[PDB]
Amino acid sequence: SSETGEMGILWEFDPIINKWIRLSMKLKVERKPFAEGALREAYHTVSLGVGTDENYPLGTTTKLFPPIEMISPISKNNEAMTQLKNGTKFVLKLYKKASRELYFEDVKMQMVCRDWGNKFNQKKPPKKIEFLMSWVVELIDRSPSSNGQPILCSIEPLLVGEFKKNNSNYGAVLTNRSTPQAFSHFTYELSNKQMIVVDIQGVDDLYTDPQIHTPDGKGFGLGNLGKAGINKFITTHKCNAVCALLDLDVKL
Ligand SMILES: [Zn+2]
């Protein structure tokens, strides 16, 4: 896209292949954020097109993430081209002060959840589910951080409407809605008790910002509360109609 904007390197994860896709994009960001936290700020932004990474060759990196073996050389099949197509309005998130690896893990996590989202929908439930696409972006045209590292930011599509938390990452149950609860339960059982997708939130059944727990506690960022988090979900969990429809064992 021709018009005056910022350039950026766009990373997309493929949970099917377990590999990272590398891309380029041009984007126009608003000077002022429309949201704040103690942790992060959110900025409205427009896509001025998505392209391939060829002009910005990755080279041989020693200490960055991800490693080359983790990268897919082919990029042809991806969501970004279409979802972040020229003209598209979206959200840009910025974390204050954590590390590179963890930024990528968030996006990895998101994709894994999105995937299980589709696995859930395959079983033809009354209400279908979707997790938002997310992406890592390297802001190249901006001068790098205090350390050598360039400026990193996460990105997702606009999420319009009344935002609702249905469960939490530590066993809270926050809505009478039964679908979100069933979905987390579903993920626990069908993963052979290896993972849960909790912290299910968003507008209706369009979800974002999830969190995964795993027994060993390894992976999926600092929000992974391991066996503890899994227990908390289970101790508060009451199976419902949708649990039942899916042949979900009442015992966890
Ligand atoms: Zn259940």
Numbering used by the authors: 553 to 649, 655 to 809
Can I see the authors' text?
Dictyostelium myosin-II heavy chain kinase A (MHCK-A) phosphorylates the α-helical coiled-coil tail of myosin-II, causing contractile bipolar filaments of myosin-II to disassemble into inactive monomers. MHCK-A is a member of the atypical α-kinase family of serine/threonine protein kinases. The α-kinase domain is bi-lobed, with the active site located in a large cleft at the junction of the two lobes. The α-kinase N-lobe is similar to the N-lobe of other protein kinases but the C-lobe has a distinctive structure and requires a tightly bound zinc atom for stability.
